[PDB]
Design a protein around this motif. Structure first.
Motif, PDB file in Angstrom:
ATOM      1  N   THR A  11     -14.413 -26.714-104.298  1.00  0.00           N
ATOM      2  CA  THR A  11     -15.678 -26.141-103.846  1.00  0.00           C
ATOM      3  C   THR A  11     -16.697 -26.076-104.972  1.00  0.00           C
ATOM      4  O   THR A  11     -16.387 -25.612-106.063  1.00  0.00           O
ATOM      5  CB  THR A  11     -15.474 -24.723-103.268  1.00  0.00           C
ATOM      6  N   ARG A  55     -20.396 -24.585-105.531  1.00  0.00           N
ATOM      7  CA  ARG A  55     -21.479 -23.757-105.021  1.00  0.00           C
ATOM      8  C   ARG A  55     -22.598 -23.604-106.042  1.00  0.00           C
ATOM      9  O   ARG A  55     -22.374 -23.144-107.158  1.00  0.00           O
ATOM     10  CB  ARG A  55     -20.928 -22.395-104.581  1.00  0.00           C
ATOM     11  N   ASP A  97      -5.845 -28.632-102.469  1.00  0.00           N
ATOM     12  CA  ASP A  97      -6.526 -29.915-102.573  1.00  0.00           C
ATOM     13  C   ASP A  97      -8.011 -29.843-102.216  1.00  0.00           C
ATOM     14  O   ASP A  97      -8.669 -30.873-102.081  1.00  0.00           O
ATOM     15  CB  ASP A  97      -5.805 -30.984-101.729  1.00  0.00           C
ATOM     16  N   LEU A  98      -8.534 -28.629-102.052  1.00  0.00           N
ATOM     17  CA  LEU A  98      -9.942 -28.438-101.712  1.00  0.00           C
ATOM     18  C   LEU A  98     -10.747 -27.961-102.917  1.00  0.00           C
ATOM     19  O   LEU A  98     -10.429 -26.936-103.522  1.00  0.00           O
ATOM     20  CB  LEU A  98     -10.098 -27.429-100.571  1.00  0.00           C
ATOM     21  N   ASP A 144     -19.623 -35.503 -94.935  1.00  0.00           N
ATOM     22  CA  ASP A 144     -21.048 -35.390 -94.622  1.00  0.00           C
ATOM     23  C   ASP A 144     -21.665 -34.250 -95.418  1.00  0.00           C
ATOM     24  O   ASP A 144     -21.096 -33.161 -95.489  1.00  0.00           O
ATOM     25  CB  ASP A 144     -21.264 -35.135 -93.124  1.00  0.00           C
ATOM     26  N   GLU A 145     -22.853 -34.489 -95.968  1.00  0.00           N
ATOM     27  CA  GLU A 145     -23.533 -33.480 -96.765  1.00  0.00           C
ATOM     28  C   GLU A 145     -25.030 -33.390 -96.500  1.00  0.00           C
ATOM     29  O   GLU A 145     -25.705 -34.398 -96.293  1.00  0.00           O
ATOM     30  CB  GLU A 145     -23.317 -33.758 -98.259  1.00  0.00           C
ATOM     31  N   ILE A 146     -25.535 -32.163 -96.491  1.00  0.00           N
ATOM     32  CA  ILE A 146     -26.953 -31.913 -96.318  1.00  0.00           C
ATOM     33  C   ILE A 146     -27.371 -31.357 -97.672  1.00  0.00           C
ATOM     34  O   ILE A 146     -27.002 -30.243 -98.047  1.00  0.00           O
ATOM     35  CB  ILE A 146     -27.226 -30.899 -95.194  1.00  0.00           C
ATOM     36  N   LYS A 148     -32.780 -22.655-103.388  1.00  0.00           N
ATOM     37  CA  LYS A 148     -31.854 -22.781-102.266  1.00  0.00           C
ATOM     38  C   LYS A 148     -30.396 -22.645-102.686  1.00  0.00           C
ATOM     39  O   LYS A 148     -29.996 -23.138-103.736  1.00  0.00           O
ATOM     40  CB  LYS A 148     -32.057 -24.120-101.550  1.00  0.00           C
ATOM     41  N   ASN A 149     -29.616 -21.957-101.860  1.00  0.00           N
ATOM     42  CA  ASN A 149     -28.193 -21.764-102.110  1.00  0.00           C
ATOM     43  C   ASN A 149     -27.407 -22.799-101.314  1.00  0.00           C
ATOM     44  O   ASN A 149     -27.473 -22.809-100.082  1.00  0.00           O
ATOM     45  CB  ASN A 149     -27.751 -20.359-101.675  1.00  0.00           C
ATOM     46  N   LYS A 157     -12.434 -32.889-100.571  1.00  0.00           N
ATOM     47  CA  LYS A 157     -11.195 -33.400-101.119  1.00  0.00           C
ATOM     48  C   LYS A 157     -11.578 -34.661-101.890  1.00  0.00           C
ATOM     49  O   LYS A 157     -12.450 -35.416-101.459  1.00  0.00           O
ATOM     50  CB  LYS A 157     -10.221 -33.747 -99.991  1.00  0.00           C
ATOM     51  N   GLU A 162     -23.558 -25.188-100.866  1.00  0.00           N
ATOM     52  CA  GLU A 162     -22.115 -25.140-101.053  1.00  0.00           C
ATOM     53  C   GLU A 162     -21.454 -26.335-100.389  1.00  0.00           C
ATOM     54  O   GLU A 162     -21.767 -26.672 -99.247  1.00  0.00           O
ATOM     55  CB  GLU A 162     -21.524 -23.860-100.459  1.00  0.00           C
ATOM     56  N   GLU A 194     -26.109 -21.804-106.806  1.00  0.00           N
ATOM     57  CA  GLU A 194     -26.983 -20.693-106.436  1.00  0.00           C
ATOM     58  C   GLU A 194     -28.286 -20.645-107.222  1.00  0.00           C
ATOM     59  O   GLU A 194     -28.280 -20.639-108.454  1.00  0.00           O
ATOM     60  CB  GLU A 194     -26.256 -19.357-106.605  1.00  0.00           C
ATOM     61  N   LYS A 227     -29.613 -35.910 -95.234  1.00  0.00           N
ATOM     62  CA  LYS A 227     -28.322 -35.978 -94.557  1.00  0.00           C
ATOM     63  C   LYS A 227     -27.605 -37.203 -95.115  1.00  0.00           C
ATOM     64  O   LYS A 227     -27.829 -38.330 -94.662  1.00  0.00           O
ATOM     65  CB  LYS A 227     -28.515 -36.086 -93.042  1.00  0.00           C
TER      66      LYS A 227
END
Ligand SMILES: O=S(=O)(O)c1cccc2cccc(Nc3ccccc3)c12
Ligand SMILES: O=S(=O)(O)c1cccc2cccc(Nc3ccccc3)c12
Ligand SMILES: [Cl-]
Lengths: 131, 131
Positions: free
Chosen positions: B50, B52, B47-48, B71-73, B58-59, B65, B61, B54, B79
């Motif tokens: 991802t 990413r 259920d995850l 929370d995301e940066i 900036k990289n 769910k 990731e 690249e 933020k």
């Protein structure tokens, strides 16, 4: 928690292959993973901590809040449940998956950042120096 | 949700500078991010999900769910609070920060992956292609 902030680069690695073996990493993957000299980039935004790791092998990035469990996809592709605490002045990370568990302790010692990864008695020590 | 898995190369970009200008990206970093050709790698593990990205800029990731706030940066170091859902077959992402909000829509249009970034009127469109 502010003592770990910064951009560190690997300068020493000991028993990393024995540690990867114990967590179950594949022979060919242990090979290329050991040849990598990753850069750990730690940052903080309010109550959110970020640990970015960059290398030839793979780039990873986890954002978390101290003491709150989160889901993590490790570089070696394990879906684990992590929990990071500020224990004895050291960020202590515990990863649980499939009944197994591993501890990744990141502590400060002088001008360097020591990273101890343990799994069933096997210990791997990786020393980082600020870039 | 399985229709998104894979490595994707950026083949086209339209009005991306206008979108960044709106979200508050600085003139200098806005020109650096405009020259990057990101590689969006989408993967799933239970259920995850991802995602990413690249690039030379900036990289980043993000693991998440569906329907569960996290929370995301962002790449431009904002933020935010994100919620990604499967709305109308597309992966719709809503980021919220300081009373502001922007939606990033990831959809499949044939053999390509289209991404529509919207921020109060202005819409950017970046189309990917399997790598
Ligand atoms: O990202 S790598 O090092 O390649 C890595 C590769 C393969 C397996 C790993 C397992 C746990 C932690 C890592 N990271 C890590 C990073 C720095 C210090 C200690 C552990 C693993
Ligand atoms: O990572 S970059 O593209 O550099 C990026 C740079 C600067 C600001 C951004 C704001 C929102 C989303 C991005 N990512 C994104 C990536 C691919 C498609 C659509 C949005 C931003
Ligand atoms: Cl220091």
């Amino acid at each position: 928690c502010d003592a770990f902030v910064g951009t560190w680069k690997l300068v020493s690695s000991e028993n990393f292959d024995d540690y990867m073996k114990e967590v179950g990493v594949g022979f060919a993957t242990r090979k290329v993973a050991g040849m990598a000299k990753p850069n750990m980039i730690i940052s903080v935004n309010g109550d959110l901590v970020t640990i970015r790791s960059e290398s030839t092998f793979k780039n990873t990035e986890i954002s978390f809040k101290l003491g709150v469990e989160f889901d993590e996809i490790t570089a070696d592709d394990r879906k684990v449940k992590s929990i990071i605490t500020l224990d004895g002045g050291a960020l202590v990370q515990v990863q649980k998956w499939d009944g197994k568990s591993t501890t990744i302790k990141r502590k400060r010692d002088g001008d360097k950042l020591v990273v101890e990864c343990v799994m069933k008695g096997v210990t791997s020590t990786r020393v980082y120096e600020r870039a």
